[PDB]
Design a protein around this ligand. Structure first.
Ligand SMILES: Clc1ccccc1Nc1ncc(-c2ccccc2)n2cncc12
Length: 271
């Protein structure tokens, strides 16, 4: 729909940018208020840094994927500077939260709880025929009540025929990304499942880099031999075995997100 009919368009006046949370090559993220009272995140596009069609694509996808476990689109401003306004996540990114005094004190039970919440989010994404492609603790946000939500949908895609194929040039974080996606550019929900296994390591290590002490080429070498990541310090063995299922060689042997959610809730209500 055009901007004058689009239920998501808001007048820029409705928004007050209060505290900057982040700044990079392509714009900023702010905490601010919508209509004086409602706390919001505002991502702003730095003009000329990238296409506004490309920037707005993330908001259009979020219009289609609404769930409690996914950071919610609130509104767009489609005149420069372009804004995407969402649900505010008070405790910021999981990777950062896990390192704070409150993150430090969390028991394994609460960690397993948060893991289940993330799987539940991904189970919705899976049911809807989408993939995420950027699933990692940096892209999970944490609420004031310590609930978790999937964020950063920039690489997220509605799947045609189960597989998205990126361009020959395209590069992805080696430690988080499934071998078939690094090697062939082919992504499926099963690529995300692989990423989830890596994300579980970040949870149990409070946000440490996967494959401690290893370079990208070493990770690749080890994986091809049939090794997987060494058992993180203090990782319960049941969780580690659940990671290994996410890292099955054949994407099709990897579990569903519904399965992963189910098992993690069992782990949680047992601890
Ligand atoms: Cl603003 C936006 C646009 C597109 C997709 C998700 C979000 N939501 C958020 N992104 C980033 C942060 C954020 C950015 C920097 C540091 C910590 C959190 N955030 C906090 N609450 C909601 C969001």
């Amino acid at each position: 729909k055009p901007w004058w009919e689009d239920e998501w368009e808001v007048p820029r006046e409705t928004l007050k940018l209060v505290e900057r949370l982040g700044a990079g090559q392509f714009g900023e993220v702010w905490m601010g208020y919508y209509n004086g009272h409602t706390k919001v995140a505002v991502k702003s596009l730095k003009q000329g840094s990238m296409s506004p069609d490309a920037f707005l694509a993330e908001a259009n996808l979020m219009k289609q994927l609404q769930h409690q476990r996914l950071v919610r689109l609130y509104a767009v401003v489609t005149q420069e500077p372009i804004y995407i306004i969402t649900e505010y996540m008070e405790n910021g990114s999981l990777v950062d939260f896990l390192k704070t005094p409150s993150g430090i004190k969390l028991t394994i039970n609460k960690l397993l709880d948060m893991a289940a919440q993330i799987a539940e989010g991904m189970a919705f994404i899976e049911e809807r025929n989408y993939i995420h492609r950027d699933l990692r603790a940096a892209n999970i946000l944490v609420s004031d009540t310590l609930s978790c939500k999937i964020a950063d949908f920039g690489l997220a895609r509605l799947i045609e025929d189960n597989e998205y194929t990126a361009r020959e040039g395209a590069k992805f974080p080696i430690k988080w990304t499934a071998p078939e996606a690094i090697n062939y550019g082919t992504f499926t929900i099963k690529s995300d499942v692989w990423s989830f296994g890596i994300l579980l390591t970040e949870i149990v290590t409070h946000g440490r880099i996967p494959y401690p002490g290893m370079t990208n080429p070493e990770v690749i070498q080890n994986l091809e031999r049939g090794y997987r990541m060494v058992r993180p310090d203090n990782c319960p063995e049941e969780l580690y075995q659940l990671m290994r299922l996410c890292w099955k060689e054949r994407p099709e042997d990897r579990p569903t997100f519904d399965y992963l959610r189910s098992v993690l809730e069992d782990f949680f209500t047992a601890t």
